[PDB]
């Protein structure tokens, strides 16, 4: 019976490893479900499920905007994780719920970044700010937040360029954008397909700037998004929304139960 | 001798190590079981240990996976394309945000630097800003490579029919255009798609079957996890099913991007060259045109063995 636990348990360690959960976390989850356990694949799979929930839940309630005040949300994340698309996704979400929302493009690097957000925003009938010419993200973000403040917007969402921890230059520029506009919520956007390099980057983001929420994108495919456990761990922030496709309404609020279910099999 | 029982633990440590360095979990497993089979019933060296023996075995098989039989000499292939008086067509493809468009620009720069003219075909006709993105690149490149620096010839140019049109047909008109305007290379950019989106994978297969490019390149981020394996399996499976040839045109080579973000968790390179037995043709190491590297198989394996 000591052999029927382990055989059923290394079979769960493998499912989680294949789902891109950090190996550190699996090695830890294994001897956690083992210590805490002292029809047979239910008495086990339940106690595993419970330990996984403890991992997605940071113990913190999620930030929410208040109607009638100025709420500034700033997006950050690795190159190509899906910030820009998720920006218009989130604006469209709040706008449909009757908030006065708008998007600002503070990417001055990515070729056609402003055109991208401008077309996204234009299709969804959402006010935007950005510049073809201005090269300092801090000036666009500043002059953008300042503009939409003066027009009494409730949700001002600021898109920023992709960056990664080893480019010290880019990480400073991020903190400088944060300090300039003083966001009420910083969102860390992450690709659900991310491998083991995830914990390192997410920690690095949280160490430099004040990440308070996480959005997981590209969950509509084959990836189960196990990197999210490490992202939640590193940023000490709840997953608030998931992205489920390329379109503006491929977006829904994160629910813990179905995600851990899909993560497990 | 060396039984499986003796190697059992050091092999387990290797597997866990490889996994931690971002080699796909099942590949690490298969990798280590190969090392077991290779060593079983053999005797060790005079001063070798069971650890040093499997460590060396693993290192050799890793080097061999990374440098596969078929190389891809791209400039040489373009030289040959020029003798036949046809353009050399390259198709980039891959899932969303991995770096197709930007590495297509880097490769253009490299080609121009060797004196070939490239027509960029904007065949992502879907994602917001795809055309303007490539336009920005074309503008940046033909400032670096203007006509006044090449005897009056235009060396880069964008072929675009804007958003909404069939990708395959634009690719076709572009290749047709390159032939008539004298462009040495056509680089076809395609939209990002999930590997199991049937409609989109058929579209990708159609563009390839219809235009028979000289080189299909799969583009994958080095950040990717176990997804590296599934993306390639299903892309290659899609090119083979939605094709009506005897020996169908599969993925020819890999562009491993964002290598600058993974530190030494360099494992995705092993994941990709293990399933496709195709070479990593370029490694992407940043966001500028200069950030394009070849793949040093000895040195990548070195980084993977270390931690
Ligand atoms: N299938 C799918 N595609 C998505 C999802 N979110 C974004 N995408 C696609 O992923 C790609 C990358 O998105 P994008 O917003 O450009 O990334 P980014 O990280 O904001 N930009 P940057 O390159 O500056 O880092 C685009 O093709 C986008 O439409 C999602 O949830 N599902
Ligand atoms: N650090 C780093 N960033 C890279 C590298 N290659 C591309 N990027 C960045 O990653 C993001 C992806 O860019 P893009 O080329 O638009 O990717 P894509 O696959 O064409 N996206 P889409 O799916 O929408 O077509 C860009 O911000 C680009 O600057 C690389 O090697 N290193
Ligand atoms: N990356 C993509 N490339 C091409 N078509 C897509 C992509 N993602 C989604 N689609 C589909 O293409 C169609 C275009 O819809 P629309 O952009 O609203 O005109 C819809 O059926 C989408 O589901
Ligand atoms: Mg972006
Ligand atoms: Mg592209």
UniProtKB/Swiss-Prot annotation, chain A:
One of its GO terms (molecular function) is GTP binding. GTP binds at residues 77-84, 159-163, 217-220. Signal peptide: none annotated. GO terms for cellular component: cytoplasm; cytosol; endoplasmic reticulum; nuclear speck; nucleus; signal recognition particle, endoplasmic reticulum targeting. It is found in: Nucleus speckle; Cytoplasm; Endoplasmic reticulum. It catalyses: GTP + H2O = GDP + phosphate + H(+). Residues 1-264 are annotated as: NG domain. Keywords: Cytoplasm, Disease variant, Endoplasmic reticulum, GTP-binding, Hydrolase, Nucleotide-binding, Nucleus, Ribonucleoprotein, RNA-binding, Signal recognition particle. It comes from the Eukaryota. The keyword GTP-binding applies. The keyword GTP-binding applies. Component of the signal recognition particle (SRP) complex, a ribonucleoprotein complex that mediates the cotranslational targeting of secretory and membrane proteins to the endoplasmic reticulum (ER). As part of the SRP complex, associates with the SRP receptor (SR) component SRPRA to target secretory proteins to the endoplasmic reticulum membrane. Binds to the signal sequence of presecretory proteins when they emerge from the ribosomes. Displays basal GTPase activity, and stimulates reciprocal GTPase activation of the SR subunit SRPRA. This is Signal recognition particle subunit SRP54. The gene is SRP54. The chain holds residues 24 to 296 of 504 of the full protein.
UniProtKB/Swiss-Prot annotation, chain B:
GO terms for molecular function: ATP hydrolysis activity; GTP binding; GTPase activity; RNA binding; signal recognition particle binding. It is found in: Endoplasmic reticulum membrane. Residues 88-305 are annotated as: NG domain. GTP binds at residues 94-101, 189-193, 257-260. One of its GO terms (cellular component) is extracellular exosome. Its main location: endoplasmic reticulum. Disulfide bonds: none annotated. GO terms for biological process: cotranslational protein targeting to membrane; intracellular protein transport; protein targeting to ER; SRP-dependent cotranslational protein targeting to membrane, signal sequence recognition. It comes from the Eukaryota. Keywords: Endoplasmic reticulum, GTP-binding, Membrane, Nucleotide-binding, Phosphoprotein, Receptor. The modification Phosphoserine is found at residue 142. The modification Phosphothreonine is found at residue 247. Belongs to the GTP-binding SRP family. Heterodimer with SRPRB. Interacts with the signal recognition particle (SRP) complex subunit SRP54. Component of the signal recognition particle (SRP) complex receptor (SR). Ensures, in conjunction with the SRP complex, the correct targeting of the nascent secretory proteins to the endoplasmic reticulum membrane system. Forms a guanosine 5'-triphosphate (GTP)-dependent complex with the SRP subunit SRP54. SRP receptor compaction and GTPase rearrangement drive SRP-mediated cotranslational protein translocation into the ER. The NG domain region, also named G domain, is a special guanosine triphosphatase (GTPase) domain, which forms a guanosine 5'-triphosphate (GTP)-dependent complex with a homologous NG domain in the signal recognition particle (SRP) complex subunit SRP54. The two NG domains undergo cooperative rearrangements upon their assembly, which culminate in the reciprocal activation of the GTPase activity of one another. GTPase induced rearrangement of SR drives SRP-mediated cotranslational protein translocation into the ER. This is Signal recognition particle receptor subunit alpha. It comes from Homo sapiens. The lineage of its organism: Eukaryota, Metazoa, Chordata, Craniata, Vertebrata.
